[PDB]
């Protein structure tokens, strides 16, 4: 299609049909979107959970108890559900890790190549978690970033999703022992296919006009 | 579909043709994405700088002068470049524009439609800024989500771009006087075609494996 149309066509869904599923391929693109989003020194800070089974997806919505009860069908409703999670510190390493990565994909002609590659993203990473004492936000950033893309990809598939931050992060990081292997969880999308319940499938698209938002010089 | 091809074959320029521009109705496609990327509770915490005259890229470019050189050639070639920014403060004032924008709208069918709305968003702001304490954080999240999304479309568009994070947002914050209008930036993102010293538009793309980023249950 025309991705201005998407932009301006995909919605965030109240209500998933429950009886329509993702097909095999589009649980695999799906995958692809959240693999491949840029990051900061394509420091890839993140970690998934994709939830596609009743019991897989029972156990994310226990997170959404108490005051965020209105998020608990989406994410039972919806064919799959996306736990975007991110690292709690950026360690040495995960810097190894991504650096040998994009050795061995070839993106190094030489080692002092590898090497300047390898000593820039220390800078930076030693900069939010030595100097501003930040990182923890930082990576949080390159999250949401991995979250935006996620949401326009999925439109342009033509499937139906919700991004969701109402839900308890303490109850879904316990869930999945994610503290302990240094994940915290921040936002949740279930995606799928709306039913007829959806109000917000039908109604006008809302956004600030550009005369307040954007400034042109 | 096609979105995935898109997703994949994007990459970050790193040199711009000074010579391409883009066309006028591209410049419109571009603010339209700004425009319309979700955001929590349709908050829309941010503002944007587009510079697509070459004063106004001078201007921008003061904040990658001297320790961000390679930064600041991107901005200064690339056709038009973007400046994302995030409110300090979600402060009421913002709330009762948001909440009467989407009035204006027609999203609203009563009065008391509205007042639930307007409740919902004052309860998770009071819950960032009064509880949490972290509203700054939460809103800087929002604009991140922004970039994600942006980047995708201008891809899906067939243009070229890059996020920049290497500049000093303290230059490029006196230089347009954020501060005082209550925003702070966050990321530039050059927009144009890419030139032949683009060295990465002929790498293999890098990415962590899903063994290790992604879980399925
Ligand atoms: C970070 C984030 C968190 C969100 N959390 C919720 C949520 O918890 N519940 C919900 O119904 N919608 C949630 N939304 C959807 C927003 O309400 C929606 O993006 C906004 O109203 C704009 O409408 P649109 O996405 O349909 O264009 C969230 C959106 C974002 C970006
Ligand atoms: C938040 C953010 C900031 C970035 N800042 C820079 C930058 O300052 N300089 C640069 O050359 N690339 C920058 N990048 C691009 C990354 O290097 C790039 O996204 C990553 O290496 C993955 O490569 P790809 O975008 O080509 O897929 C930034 C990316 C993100 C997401």
Redesign the interface.
Known sequence: ?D??S???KRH?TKAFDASKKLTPEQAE?I????????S?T?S?P????????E??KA?VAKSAAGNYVFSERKMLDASHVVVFCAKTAMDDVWLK??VD??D????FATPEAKAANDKGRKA?ADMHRKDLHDDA?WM???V??????????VA???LDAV?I?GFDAAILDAE?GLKEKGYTS?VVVPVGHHSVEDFNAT????????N??????
Chains 1, 2 share one sequence.
């Open positions: 299609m991705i201005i998407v932009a301006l965030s693109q995958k692809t979107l959240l693999q491949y989003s840029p900061s394509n890839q993140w970690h998934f959970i994709v939830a596609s089974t019991e897989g156990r890790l991504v990565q994009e061995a994909d070839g993106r930076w936000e949080a950033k390159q949401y970033l991995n979250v935006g893309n996620f949401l326009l990809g342009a598939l033509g991004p931050e999945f921040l109604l006008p698209k809302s956004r600030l006009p550009q307040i938002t954007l400034t042109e010089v």
